[PDB]
Write a protein that binds this ligand. Structure first.
Ligand SMILES: [Mg+2]
Ligand SMILES: [Mg+2]
Ligand SMILES: [Mg+2]
Ligand SMILES: [Mg+2]
Ligand SMILES: [Mg+2]
Ligand SMILES: [Mg+2]
Ligand SMILES: [Mg+2]
Ligand SMILES: [Mg+2]
Ligand SMILES: [Mg+2]
Ligand SMILES: [Mg+2]
Ligand SMILES: [Mg+2]
Ligand SMILES: [Mg+2]
Ligand SMILES: [Mg+2]
Ligand SMILES: [Mg+2]
Ligand SMILES: [Mg+2]
Ligand SMILES: [Mg+2]
Ligand SMILES: [Mg+2]
Ligand SMILES: [Mg+2]
Ligand SMILES: [Mg+2]
Ligand SMILES: [Mg+2]
Ligand SMILES: [Mg+2]
Ligand SMILES: [Mg+2]
Ligand SMILES: [Mg+2]
Ligand SMILES: [Mg+2]
Ligand SMILES: [Mg+2]
Ligand SMILES: [Mg+2]
Ligand SMILES: [Mg+2]
Ligand SMILES: [Mg+2]
Ligand SMILES: [Mg+2]
Ligand SMILES: [Mg+2]
Ligand SMILES: [Mg+2]
Ligand SMILES: [Mg+2]
Ligand SMILES: [Mg+2]
Ligand SMILES: [Mg+2]
Ligand SMILES: [Mg+2]
Ligand SMILES: [Mg+2]
Ligand SMILES: [Mg+2]
Ligand SMILES: [Mg+2]
Ligand SMILES: [Mg+2]
Ligand SMILES: [Mg+2]
Ligand SMILES: [Mg+2]
Ligand SMILES: [Mg+2]
Ligand SMILES: [Mg+2]
Ligand SMILES: [Mg+2]
Ligand SMILES: [Mg+2]
Ligand SMILES: [Mg+2]
Ligand SMILES: [Mg+2]
Ligand SMILES: [Mg+2]
Ligand SMILES: [Mg+2]
Ligand SMILES: [Mg+2]
Lengths: 119, 73, 88, 101
RNA sequence: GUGGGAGAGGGUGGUGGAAUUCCCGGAGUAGCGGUGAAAUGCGCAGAUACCGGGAGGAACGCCGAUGGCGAAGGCAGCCACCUGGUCCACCCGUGACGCUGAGGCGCGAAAGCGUGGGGAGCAAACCGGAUUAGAUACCCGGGUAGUCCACGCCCUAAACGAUGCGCGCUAGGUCUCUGGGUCUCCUGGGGGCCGAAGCUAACGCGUUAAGCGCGCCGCCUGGGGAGUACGGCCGCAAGGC
């Protein structure tokens, strides 16, 4: 057991799942969660509620490691990314900041047919 | 909208071709690394067009960002 | 490319009389300069096509001027040709 | 002959010796490539927007030279051979274009 | 001719960062993925998510436009070189040297062919999972050619403004890109919109003509049979005229 107490919280949000990895200041994960980590299975994972549960789980799991304050990073644009942020926001865990890191390419790789009409 | 400020009106005479001048150049990027549209820069077609290249140069040189993470959110 | 120096050299060289910039002789000369330079450019860069069109056009112009010259003064024509080393 | 500007970003970590050696190698390269130096601003250590070679900083040289164009590219190539040279940007000079004056 | 201008016009070499994938390492645990819902698939040989390092290929976010350039096809990170066109000012030179153009010659998106390479992502065909009455499809997981490079072929197209080229003539208004000027504005070259006169079957066009004229080329002659058959020419072939 580490007992970090100052850390990072990554919210990875897609239209399918939301998944929350909580690392330490050097970015190594500690605990994590997701719609699947909680009981959810199908499309129900990409729920905003599912998200909330995931966030809170990650947060409590991380409390166990004695974490207190955390910087947030948000990647991906998905249902209940924001809900994840709310959850974390009052988990009792302190959010010292949010940041949106969602990656975009400068047009490198051809998307799948699903994603075309843009490259 | 974007009537809040025109980046051109902010400062006076400067060399649109100076890719080494960071303090002024930064003014034309956004919170993200993005180059501000004409709406924001208040430049002309030609002006803006020159700014583009000079800025890119400054990026490659390492003085300006290609991209920035978004704070708050 | 072609420095204004080289250009002048060829102009004064072909001018019919001092101060003649635009006579058939001069034109044809300049044209030949541009032409050879572009031909050399296209010996390498065999893949640069648009330039090539440029050259088709240059050549057309040259041949039209020459045609005109022969029509008007076959002496001046023969002379110019001999000098430039044209007729391919 | 044409007027260019040679931007050189080299390793910030360089101790005096090694840096004088670099600058030396650059003088040499320039000469061998036939570039006369009209002027130089040595800006030195400054903070890069993005890390280059895993270095948050970089050391900046700027020359303005007159050199035969036929050789310009070669010069750049030479400048880059140095491990210590992280960025080389050579531009054709241009008169300043202004806004608001 | 001289002095200038803008430009993803072309070619060669270089180079930059973002992302994807893969490899290496750390930390970490039971799921990830995906959908209408799912399943196949992937993961305890530790995936997903996260940090670090590395390899490789392809394309260039913002700027970016209602924009620009090009004869067209088409052209978009940045840098240098090599190079085509074009516009403006001066009104300096030549003195009708002009226009068009059957044939010829060249260029010609994608796909496709040949010989080498390359191969990250995508993805015909194919292999699967679903859906369905069936589903040789739509959706999902894979995936080969191909997509990329070189060289040589192919010569098509809703190759579209479905509008051949040139010149003269016939209200304006408005927005715009780019020159020049005595720079409220004027003037020249493009790109748009609305509209005089006029045209048009109509819709619409209208100084970017689809108006008024002259010159030259191409083409049409009811629908189908048919872009077929036959012949010829070209092509390695597919196939093209
Ligand atoms: Mg899901
Ligand atoms: Mg000129
Ligand atoms: Mg170009
Ligand atoms: Mg190019
Ligand atoms: Mg990468
Ligand atoms: Mg690993
Ligand atoms: Mg398992
Ligand atoms: Mg299994
Ligand atoms: Mg075990
Ligand atoms: Mg297994
Ligand atoms: Mg990595
Ligand atoms: Mg590989
Ligand atoms: Mg055009
Ligand atoms: Mg087109
Ligand atoms: Mg270079
Ligand atoms: Mg040019
Ligand atoms: Mg006169
Ligand atoms: Mg006279
Ligand atoms: Mg072709
Ligand atoms: Mg092709
Ligand atoms: Mg085949
Ligand atoms: Mg795929
Ligand atoms: Mg199937
Ligand atoms: Mg049915
Ligand atoms: Mg079927
Ligand atoms: Mg079935
Ligand atoms: Mg499978
Ligand atoms: Mg598929
Ligand atoms: Mg084959
Ligand atoms: Mg092939
Ligand atoms: Mg080819
Ligand atoms: Mg037609
Ligand atoms: Mg047709
Ligand atoms: Mg007609
Ligand atoms: Mg003509
Ligand atoms: Mg003006
Ligand atoms: Mg107009
Ligand atoms: Mg108009
Ligand atoms: Mg009327
Ligand atoms: Mg009517
Ligand atoms: Mg109209
Ligand atoms: Mg008509
Ligand atoms: Mg008839
Ligand atoms: Mg009939
Ligand atoms: Mg018929
Ligand atoms: Mg056919
Ligand atoms: Mg036959
Ligand atoms: Mg045969
Ligand atoms: Mg044909
Ligand atoms: Mg035909």
């Amino acid at each position: 057991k580490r007992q970090v107490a100052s850390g990072r919280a990554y919210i990875h949000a897609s239209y399918n799942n939301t998944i929350v990895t909580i690392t330490d200041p050097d970015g190594n994960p500690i605990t994590w969660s997701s719609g699947g980590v909680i009981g959810y299975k199908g499309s129900r994972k990409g729920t905003p509620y599912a998200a909330q549960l995931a966030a809170l789980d990650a947060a409590k799991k991380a409390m166990a490691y004695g974490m207190q304050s955390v910087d947030v990073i948000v990647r991906g644009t998905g249902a209940g990314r924001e809900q994840a942020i709310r959850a974390l926001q009052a988990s009792g865990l302190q959010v010292k900041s949010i940041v949106d890191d969602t990656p975009v390419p400068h047009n490198g790789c051809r998307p799948k047919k699903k994603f075309r009409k843009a490259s | 909208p974007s009537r809040k400020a025109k980046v051109k009106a902010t400062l006076g005479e400067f060399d649109l071709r100076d890719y080494r001048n960071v303090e002024v150049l930064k003014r034309f990027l956004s919170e993200t690394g993005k180059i501000l549209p004409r709406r924001r820069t208040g430049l002309s077609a030609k002006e803006q067009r020159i700014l583009a290249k000079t800025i890119k140069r400054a990026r490659i040189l390492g003085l300006l960002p290609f991209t920035e993470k978004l704070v708050r959110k | 490319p072609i420095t204004k120096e080289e250009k002048q050299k060829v102009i004064q060289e072909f001018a019919r009389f001092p101060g003649d910039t635009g006579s058939t002789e001069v034109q044809v000369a300049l044209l030949t300069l541009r032409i050879n330079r572009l031909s050399e450019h296209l010996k390498v860069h065999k893949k640069d096509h648009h330039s090539h069109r440029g050259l088709l056009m240059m050549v057309g112009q040259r041949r039209r001027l020459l045609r005109y010259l022969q029509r008007e003064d076959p002496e001046r024509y023969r002379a110019l040709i001999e000098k430039l080393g044209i007729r391919g | 002959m044409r007027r260019y500007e040679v931007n050189i970003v080299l390793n910030p970590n360089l101790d005096q010796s090694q840096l004088a050696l670099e600058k030396e190698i650059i003088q040499r390269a320039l000469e061998n490539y036939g570039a006369r130096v009209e002027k130089v601003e040595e800006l030195g250590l400054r903070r890069l927007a993005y890390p280059i070679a895993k270095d948050p900083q970089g050391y900046f040289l700027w020359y303005q030279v007159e050199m035969p164009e036929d050789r310009v590219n070669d010069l750049a190539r030479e400048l880059r051979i140095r491990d210590n040279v992280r960025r080389v940007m050579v531009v054709k000079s241009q008169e300043p274009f202004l806004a608001n004056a």
